Symmetry: C3
Subunit: 340 residues, 3 copies
């Protein structure tokens, strides 16, 4: 909600209180989504000042407050900053911004990252360029310097983040994305590569000195319809865990596919059919094993811009003997959303 | 403070900076309230959109930021989300909401939960239905479908929350409250029962498979006067610790009583006299022992809606040989409040 | 940004998204500032209600959200409340406020605490009176009861805070500051002393029962120029660590000096030259050793009140054999700031 707009500066204060519960069977970790209460809230600000007609500055911070902890010592679990960055936008030369933000390959992966609750499975956090990272400098240009409507690109520089954990670290890397949109059609390509930190290299799973990820995207988004497809591959980047052994590291390679079809009824309903498969190849010891494999069916009802409800059902195709331990049970999720 | 109100949506952004200090003697844990600096702040949002004349959506999130930690590693201590839920309200059919919220038995207990700083001792957090819980679905109806002015009720479904700690877990349970108000008189009844988790059952104190709590309330709240009385009992639900032994668990039974009398002078002052006793019966090993027992005297001066000050004095009646280790010293608390 | 102003109450909701990166060499801890991504955000509220023409109430809370953590388990690192207090201001009698706030000696030290990114090195957090503390009651008077324009003073009472850590605890202490300003000239004196807690006394470095700190300040701040000098000394208060041995405690004495010169071009640029030295004397085992010693050069460009950029360069004078392990490398820091 735009709570401030004066003298060139305009501030948007935003957030949401999401009452959400997941249903599975088990103890719920042969399931996809797990099980039980998963309520949470979000708070953020989006600022934008007009330094002059050509020049704009902006900043953004967004936090996540879990809503299913007790008020004891574990109160904070799951709490974190998703985004925190500032930057400048100059006439048609481009925008530049620095901070904790979405990696460039997410430029592609975001196409199919639209289910009511699940989806976007290959867009992991703190994972080189596919999801939200820390320390990235991102240059983005639109319509090629104002000369070609609809043709955009970006380059992104990723700084080393030697973290406690091999799962959330990264060496320096570079990535870029090119994308073209026209009359409801959108096509994208993204690619980044990086150095892996020493601790990454010590993990029993995956061998290599460099982290690569790329992804392609195609989409039709007009006339209330939304059809979208992503296809991408990664070398030494996706984190995997062998639950039997408890070993962990990165998949040597992954081939990933995501398809999404949605329709927006004018009375509020948005049915969604989606399909996702991601499989790791040449896993030291295991061979070819699926990480993610499912059909998804779901609906969002929008009462208005502020209120909505949804159900998201994962028909999990992962099978039961999965040699990494990936759980095979469906999960259903029901949520009620207030946002401003 | 209502910072946003446009197009059917209205947002209230609220909070308080409470400078507060408690005085006891000791080392301050033969005391009631403990001792020293206890400053804190609160931040929350309350949203409400009008989907149409009969239908309303709403959400709420409220957080607690301790103000007496250092800026080292213990900085976060005491930090948590009190509330986080969203829901819908439909004409006279009722409201429904899901999330982290007040349990139904608090519907009664809130009557006497009005001291300047202390009080509400039996309304514990994460304790089945008496204080704020996680995972509750709550249906509330007012004036019996619009047919009986002043007669209200609610049912509440509580989902299992298998937490790390027996103190903050719960199995599934159900509760309800009925209440009638008329010309300043208010009467209430509340009751919930639940399954106890396995870990609850492993604790050395208390034996049983089910958690019950009920409470009754009576109140006169008109003409600047506030008189209120609560009486309730609980079976296997109230958490107790044996400080000598260090054992812990739930009281087999408790009988609880709370009385409150306050008066609101028109120039700002609100004297408060209150009395509270809560006693656990049949404690494995101990027998009948008081948990809470005191007189309270105190005053709030309201400079206006935004500013106020208060003193709260607990004349602790707990005696010195208390066989559970419950501390017996008075505590005095002085606070200065800014809220918006 | 003033988001609320009605009926005597006015609320300011404020914050900043700071994209910031430090450059050093090493592994970056022979450096001054360390090295890598150091992005963060800040959020706070400042409230003020008018109880009547003479009487005002106010409160403030400000938090710090790190922006360089991953979204794993270390997500919260560096997160804390800087300020949290409430108070009253009465006509010319004075203001009084209680809570987590700046200690009185910071009244002086703030003169030179103006570099773009570094500086204010002797203003430590949770360190008796020089930086932000918890539990202080502060009385401040301006223009001596309205009788002497420009002559101000304050007294401050500091309560014992027995914390886990000797570094962040304190016994009770008292401090005051007197200060005079006139036509761009400002002069200040501040002094506080305190008892040290038992755990403080157990540390291998520093011997004594009392913590003292004082500081003096001189400043010219008019006509776009800013020249400022601080000189202060402390007995048993400044925390020091012997990195070779890993011992830790407080410097027996320190003599501290800080000088700052800045100029504000009307087109936005603010060059800064600064110099800082702080040295501990009579260190059990070491003798006289510098803690802080450097030249600093830097610039801030202000696009407007909301946006700005800066570079801050520390020409570290600490030498390489420093007998406490204090690192000797320069650090450069580049930041981009959005604030509202």
């Amino acid at each position: 909600a735009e709570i401030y707009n004066k003298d060139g500066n305009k501030v948007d204060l935003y957030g949401k209180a999401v009452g959400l519960h997941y249903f599975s069977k088990g103890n719920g970790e042969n399931s996809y989504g797990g099980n039980g209460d998963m309520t949470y809230a979000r708070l953020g600000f989006k600022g934008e000042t007009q330094i002059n007609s050509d020049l704009t500055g902006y900043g953004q911070w967004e936090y996540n407050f879990q809503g299913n902890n007790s008020e004891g010592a574990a109160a904070q679990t799951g709490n974190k900053t998703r985004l925190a960055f500032a930057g400048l936008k100059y006439a048609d030369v481009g925008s530049f911004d620095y901070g904790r933000n979405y990696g460039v390959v997410y430029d592609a992966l975001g196409y199919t990252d639209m289910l009511p609750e699940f989806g976007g499975d290959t867009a992991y956090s703190d994972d080189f360029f596919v999801g939200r990272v820390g320390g990235v400098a991102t240059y983005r240009n639109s319509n090629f310097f104002g000369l070609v409507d609809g043709l955009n690109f970006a380059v992104q520089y990723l700084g080393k983040n030697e973290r406690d954990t091999a799962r959330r670290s990264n060496g320096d890397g570079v990535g870029g994305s090119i994308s073209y949109e026209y009359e409801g059609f959108g096509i994208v390509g993204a690619y980044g590569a990086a150095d892996r930190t020493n601790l990454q290299e010590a993990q029993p799973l995956g061998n290599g000195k460099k982290a690569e990820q790329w992804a392609t995207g195609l989409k039709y988004d007009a006339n209330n319809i939304y059809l979208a497809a992503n296809y991408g591959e990664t070398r030494n980047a996706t984190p995997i865990t062998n639950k039997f052994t408890n070993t962990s590291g990165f998949a040597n390679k992954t081939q990933d596919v995501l398809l999404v079809a949605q329709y927006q009824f004018d009375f509020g309903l948005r049915p969604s059919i989606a399909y996702t498969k991601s499989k790791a190849k040449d896993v030291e010891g295991i061979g070819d094993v699926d990480l993610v494999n499912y059909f998804e069916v779901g609906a969002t009802y929008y009462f208005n811009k502020n209120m909505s409800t949804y159900v998201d059902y994962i028909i999990n195709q992962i099978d039961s003997d999965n040699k990494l331990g990936v759980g095979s049970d469906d999960t259903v999720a029901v949520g009620i959303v207030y946002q401003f």
